[model samples]
Target: KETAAAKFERQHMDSSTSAASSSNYCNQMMKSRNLTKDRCKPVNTFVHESLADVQAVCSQKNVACKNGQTNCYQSYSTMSITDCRETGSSKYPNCAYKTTQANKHIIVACEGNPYVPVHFDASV
Candidate 1:
């Protein structure tokens, strides 16, 4: 069984990629990370921080998730991240993306005994 934590890792974790040089960064990453199989992910973010650093957000400031979930927490420090958004005219199996990089505090929803992030709520 794939835990939500695993899913979150596949979708958001990227500790090694410090910067995105190509314009097709998202197009390739979204697919390689398995976010393009069912339907293209409308928008997503990749956090360029270590797994431990990201998981530590579970103990950060508590906040409301976008969907109103109360398990959300915001990171205390800014981190390097990349945002991948599907182009308006893009279609599945040929998904296109617009990549944007930034340094910001991230918000995510956490769960389970280890209390790791299972959902990316937002970044500020």
Candidate 2:
């Protein structure tokens, strides 16, 4: 017996699949973002949670860390400061500093599609 939530999930999943007959759901989403095959490199950061959640944090900070932004930051335990660069097409570029001061790990949230962190390095 499927619960209401499960039933809803199944129905939605079926609908989403049906909506994209030629491509998978993820591919369709990525196509909308102007991201090609090689452009889909995973972002490098430290948080081990959903990429959307981390992007939300960056968005809230007005750091301009948008979908295609190539920016990085210097973060401590509870705070971060943006380190913008000008090499990439992103509104924000890479960080001048290669390391972070945070005690846990470095969390990187990628730009598009399955917008999620590609890495979480704690030893760095």
Candidate 3:
């Protein structure tokens, strides 16, 4: 079984050299990355930063998660990330998404021991 951290990495981590320029980055990635099987994920963020720096956010400034959860944080670095949002006309079993790449400090929700990211809250 995959650990929490590994699962998180699978969904949220995008390494360097992943220079996404195509408008359909979200369309392909959301499906290939398992974000479309169960349901079209409405919105998601992928961080293109070093593993160590992303993990170090466990000690970052705490913030109120939009959902009011207690495990939220605000990262300091203006990191590279991709925001994926479903398109208006996307049909089930044939999901499509809009990909947006930008550099911003992000918000996240972390859980479990060792304190790793579980959710990408927003780009701040």
Candidate 4:
């Protein structure tokens, strides 16, 4: 298993590239604002569990080791559901869906800079 620092470093490097790709998408969304001028916020990358994996677990019986309905609570940490869903044709499928819970946090890395966590209103 990778240490927290190592995981942070590896994720940061990967997120740097991912942020570039997402920047275009973010910019397009920002255009909808009526403001004459706008400042771009850095796009952060979020790494989380795949939707398929979550669905597979959901489809299985005995999700809980216990036999009572009281034990049917969803396990957010291990078998947490994600937003990815299956799309496209049977021959060529895609994953597209969004879940309420976030399995992994976002990490933002500016150009030629180290990775940092992006802060936002949790209540929002």
Q: Higher lDDT: candidate 3 or 4?
A: 3
The runs of at least 3 residues in candidate 1 whose Cα sits more than 4 Å from the true structure, single-residue gaps closed, are none
Ranking by lDDT: 1, 3, 2, 4
In candidate 1, position 119 carries an lDDT of 93
Each prediction's TM-score versus the true structure: 0.95, 0.21, 0.89, 0.18
Clashing pairs in 1: none
Q: Cα deviation in Å at residue 97, candidate 2?
A: 26
Q: Itemize residue pairs with steric clashes in candidate 2.
A: 45-106, 45-107, 45-108, 46-106, 46-107, 46-108, 47-107
Q: Using lDDT as the measure, which candidate wins? A: 1
> TM-score-based ranking, best first?
1, 3, 2, 4
lDDT (Cα, tens digit) per residue for candidate 2, span 1-124: 8453332222222221212323133233333423233444222222323323343432332222334445322123332211111223322121121222232323232333433223221222
* Pick by TM-score: 1 or 4, better one: 1
Candidate 3: regions farther than 4 A off = 16-18
Instruction: Name the better of 2 and 4 by lDDT.
Output: 2
lDDT of each: 0.91, 0.28, 0.83, 0.27
Model 4 off-target regions past 4 Å? 15-18, 22-124
Error of 1 at 44 (Å): 0.9
Q: Per the 3 Å backbone cut-off, how many clashing residue pairs does candidate 2 have?
A: 7
